[PDB]
Design a protein around this ligand. Structure first.
Ligand SMILES: *C(=O)N1C[C@H](NOS(=O)(=O)O)CC[C@H]1C(N)=O
Length: 271
């Protein structure tokens, strides 16, 4: 029973690190799933940028906005961890450049600029509702949204709700084909999760992921795994309440990646 074994492995991993760990995995090949705390709330932190890019792409699909539109912004708009938008402030950036900066590089000002085209955090929440997600809510902008206070509903998702969004966006009909590919490309080009889920994957497997990190020992990684020989796999991993270093948190997420990859391989072999 690969799903039961994966869930036991997650429970042991969570306990030995003193964290609260939320995971949802769904293999599109076997259609099998496993989870831990999949319906509990966790802070999104930078992972909201996946949804913000999805909402911008959906607007582009409908003609409600354009990826080629030039967005101007000021030095006053720059927030921490904005390595792309900061240097380009005087010239501005197009919406597609901002989507890429937010998703591939986790650029915080880029995330805020995307939100400014969507109606702010309320618009991102409305977008999640339109995807059938009744749990996710964004309430603050960068970097206030990273507070990650236990019990606080603001700026949270659930592992299952976010996995559902990943399915609709990357594998379902929430985006047209060209936009689906753009989002996959931005996720697959990211390096920010090299020591997180990706570090746990077998050679020849790929992940297009969106990382995040916040207060109260919060560290997240969500995305789509494309295995060496299998259909895609949805994965959402939210870790919080760690008292350990960032590197130690990253290693827990790498182990989640190993647990997930083994379950997928076992389903494929019929183990
Ligand atoms: C996202 O959660 N953030 C943006 C940036 N990149 O880290 S990530 O790759 O884990 O997303 C710094 C951490 C965090 C933030 N403080 O906004």
């Amino acid at each position: 029973n690969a799903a039961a074994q994966a869930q036991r492995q997650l429970a042991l991993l969570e306990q030995r690190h003193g964290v609260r760990l939320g995971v949802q995995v769904h293999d599109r090949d076997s259609d099998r799933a496993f989870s831990h705390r999949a319906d509990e709330r966790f802070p999104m932190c930078s992972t909201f940028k996946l949804l913000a890019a999805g909402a911008v792409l959906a607007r582009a699909d409908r003609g409600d906005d354009s990826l080629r539109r030039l967005i101007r912004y000021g030095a006053a708009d720059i927030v921490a961890y904005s390595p792309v938008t900061g240097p380009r402030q005087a010239e501005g950036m197009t919406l597609e450049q901002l989507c890429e900066a937010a998703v591939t590089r986790s650029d915080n000002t880029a995330g805020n600029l995307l939100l400014s085209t969507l109606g702010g955090p309320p618009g991102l929440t409305a977008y999640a509702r339109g995807l059938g997600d009744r749990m996710t809510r964004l309430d603050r902008i960068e970097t206030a949204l990273n507070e990650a206070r236990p019990g606080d509903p603001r700026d949270t998702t659930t592992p299952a709700a976010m996995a559902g969004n990943l399915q609709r966006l990357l594998l379902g009909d929430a985006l047209q084909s060209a936009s689906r590919q753009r989002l996959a490309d931005w996720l697959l080009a990211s390096q920010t999760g090299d020591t997180r889920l990706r570090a746990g994957l077998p050679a020849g497997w790929r992940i297009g992921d969106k990382t995040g990190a916040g207060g109260h020992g919060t560290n997240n990684d969500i995305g789509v795994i494309w295995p060496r020989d299998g259909a895609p796999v949805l994965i959402s991993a939210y870790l919080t309440q760690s008292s350990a270093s960032r590197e130690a948190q990253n290693a827990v997420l790498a182990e989640v990646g190993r647990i997930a990859a083994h379950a997928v391989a076992a389903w494929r072999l019929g183990s």
